[model samples]
Target: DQESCKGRCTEGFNVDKKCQCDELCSYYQSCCTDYTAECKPQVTRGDVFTM
Candidate 1:
């Protein structure tokens, strides 16, 4: 989550992009200007395996 955030941008503003949205884009402040608004890391869980 934090890694996807990268950093906040107050200069380059792109209507098609956002700073934060979901798990992969979880940012405390404004949305990121590089990332696009869409279905972020959601219920998609990991694989289940046994040894």
Candidate 2:
């Protein structure tokens, strides 16, 4: 089956879907294929420091 994140990404746990897109899904290893792209935290770079 093709997993999608159209409406699967929510704030809490979802028993309806086979996989999850919640925050704890990563630790539980039950995250969907697109969880990273859809729910994962984005990394931002900081400015360089001068000596």
The C-alpha RMSD in Å for every predicted model, in order, reads: 9.3, 10.7
Worst 10 residues of 2 by lDDT: 42-51
1-51: candidate 1 lDDT, tens digit per residue: 344432234234344333344333443222334234542333223322111
Instruction: Please write out the lDDT profile of model 2 over residues 1-51, one tens digit for every residue.
Output: 124442244433445453445444443343446344433333222212112
Model 2, TM vs. native? 0.20
Backbone clashes in candidate 1 total 5
lDDT (C-alpha, whole model) for all candidates: 0.35, 0.38
User: Of the candidates shown, which would achieve the greatest TM-score relative to the real structure?
Assistant: 2
Give the candidate number with the greatest lDDT: 2
